[PDB]
Structure 1
């Protein structure tokens, strides 16, 4: 498709959408905040080579004015063609990344440099690390054909089915999924279904449930979703606080998948994802930790965690601790911010 010219129908819906955002005087989305009339007028007639327009970017945040973010990338090239809108939204949302920065090449780092965080189990309830990936050579959800979903699933399942040892497990397609399996996966908190209204409006649920499925290892410490928001959502999780083991399992899985399937990647934004909140390392690390002594002063807790760019959220003195930074640092740096921040928080708890 050409870089220029959208048809009259698309132009008309785009104008109607801008007006709807403006008429919404109280709308809080980053879309409303960053799509100025000047940016809109500059990029409204552009297209990617896949034929995606600005409407394929903003429609979800127009249909759902209460979105927090409110745009998605219909294909990898949208991040460039429509960078005038994506850039300010990305650099607003993410911590420590600014226009002109280039996200570093992937580096999981030296796993041996991770210690043991809470061997006794006195503090940390559970530990999770989540990543996402898109498959190189395909558009993203709004542009995928029925044939695309089938081919991506075949490739993903070929990789997952060959996982050995710690990672060995079972793939469950959504296509034909039995009520028995739905019930079992719900109990494990492993099931996804057809997307909510934000994904529906983004045209991310086309040809449902073709190409969609759920994989987990037998120990239920490794989970993969195929074709939900991204081609791959990859999670390592376990009870207790052994961040080294959780991260090592994740690294082993992603490396093994990459040997067969390259991932969509951008020179400045890192790994490309359907929602721009998942860019860079894509890392969403989360530890539930009991800090009842530090709970007497939430501000010193928030402040101490913030020295390592960690976010504190009460869930009772139990907190969800997570990495603020996903872009502009390596995977090793992000997971080490969690390790070092949690180390300081535990020392503070013991000292109080």
Structure 2
């Protein structure tokens, strides 16, 4: 990435011509001129935020964020870039709005145990950053190793439902690796160019690794896209339990990290901070794998997804999850999943009977 202030702003300004990303829509020659000479306490500059957006012009059909933060201070130092990108990507969320965090699983009160004939598996995942180290697109091997070191020691101390074991990618045996492959716990070097272009793939697999509890119901990936990626999963429909395991496991790693002088990066405005702006706030994606045989063929599938504020992705089973991140707490996001997936299983149980279905007005369930 890197700039050179001996050069004129216009000589260094990126050619964002046929680019279709949140970064390219916001950058103007002035914004670059104004912020091109700044940098974070760690040496992270604007050229470094926008690099992956200069390299990846993408496709007109879909918009990527096109930029990353290498620090907790990148969001502040370069707020004039990030601010409008955050308001756009996250539905008008202003520079002056606040993000409420809610990990009291007891507040899911009104959320349940979804139909096993339709919900194959239930799952909640989030991403965390650790205060004190820079984010993956910038962190040094020393920083990476410290994050891995701190995490492994926290995880190794966990006990009971949370007792588990760590699996470094570097010295992984074929047996240890095939297991993880058919356990769905494995990750490898990023092939995505949006990921590769921000420089977060350097030194692979130094300090990267995989941790999971003995029950294989709780998983943590270390040093991949963000310092930590945590997941609570289950076969079936007990979303309450998946969220509760998730919440309790998170609070146990969080206090160990607090005590060591390294809490999860978090601020009243952005909630939990992570490397990609589209993940700010909760970093959460709670979802299910549902059999929507008829509903998915229905003309109003897309619209019903939108009004329930959920979204889907491949796997006639779909991976449906909440679509919000900033502006709403985790209890409210996993609440919308329980609600709209309950509704959709009802709708599917009607079409099975040749009956017509009824949508709800927007933003509920």
TM-score, normalised relative to structure 2: 0.85
Cα distance in 1, alignment partners of residues 163 and 204 from structure 2: 27
1:194-225 CA distances to partner (integer Å, 9 max, x unpaired)? 23333332121233322211001223222110
CA spacing shift, 1:122–1:96, aligned 2, 3 Å: farther
SS state of the match for residue 286, structure 1? strand
Question: What is residue 228 of structure 1 aligned with on the other side?
Answer: 224
Q: Does 1:91 align with 2:63?
A: no
Cα distance in 1, alignment partners of residues 307 and 6 from structure 2: 47
Contact 2:114 2:239 in 1 (8 A): no
Question: What is residue 38 of structure 2 aligned with on the other side?
Answer: 46
SS state of the match for residue 127, structure 2? strand
Contact 2:190 2:196 in 1 (8 A): yes
Cα distance in 2, alignment partners of residues 13 and 218 from structure 1: 57
* 1:230-269 correspondence runs (5 A): 230-261=226-257, 262-269=263-270
Cα distance in 2, alignment partners of residues 251 and 132 from structure 1: 13
Question: What is residue 4 of structure 1 aligned with on the other side?
Answer: none
Cα distance in 2, alignment partners of residues 15 and 117 from structure 1: 58
* 1:162-181 correspondence runs (5 A): 162-181=157-176
Contact 2:232 2:242 in 1 (8 A): yes
Contact 2:156 2:163 in 1 (8 A): yes
| Deviation for aligned residue 1:184 | 2.4
Cα distance in 2, alignment partners of residues 11 and 35 from structure 1: 21
* Structure that is richer in helix per residue: 1
CA spacing shift, 1:10–1:282, aligned 2, 3 Å: farther
| Deviation for aligned residue 1:69 | 1.9
SS state of the match for residue 16, structure 2? helix
Contact 1:96 1:327 in 2 (8 A): no
1:250-304 CA distances to partner (integer Å, 9 max, x unpaired)? 11110000111110112211100011111101111221211223234241x3333
| Deviation for aligned residue 1:84 | 1.1
Question: What is residue 53 of structure 2 aligned with on the other side?
Answer: 61
Question: What is residue 203 of structure 1 aligned with on the other side?
Answer: 199
- In structure 1, stretches of 5+ residues that fail to align are 1-6
Question: What is residue 154 of structure 1 aligned with on the other side?
Answer: 149
Question: What is residue 101 of structure 1 aligned with on the other side?
Answer: 97
Q: Does 1:116 align with 2:116?
A: no
CA spacing shift, 1:62–1:10, aligned 2, 3 Å: farther
* 1:12-23 correspondence runs (5 A): 18-22=13-17
Cα distance in 2, alignment partners of residues 112 and 321 from structure 1: 18
Question: What is residue 358 of structure 2 aligned with on the other side?
Answer: none
CA spacing shift, 1:103–1:41, aligned 2, 3 Å: same
Q: Does 1:329 align with 2:321?
A: no
Q: Single out whichever of 283-292 and 125-134 deviates more from structure 2.
A: 283-292
| Deviation for aligned residue 1:10 | 6.4
Contact 1:302 1:312 in 2 (8 A): no
Question: What is residue 292 of structure 2 aligned with on the other side?
Answer: 291
Cα distance in 2, alignment partners of residues 41 and 56 from structure 1: 15
Question: What is residue 215 of structure 2 aligned with on the other side?
Answer: 219
1:69-101 CA distances to partner (integer Å, 9 max, x unpaired)? 221101110001111111222222224633421
Cα distance in 1, alignment partners of residues 169 and 5 from structure 2: 33
Cα distance in 2, alignment partners of residues 115 and 84 from structure 1: 39
| Deviation for aligned residue 1:326 | 0.9
| Deviation for aligned residue 1:308 | 3.0
| Deviation for aligned residue 1:8 | 6.0
- In structure 2, stretches of 5+ residues that fail to align are 258-262, 356-365
How many residues are matched?
341
SS state of the match for residue 125, structure 2? strand
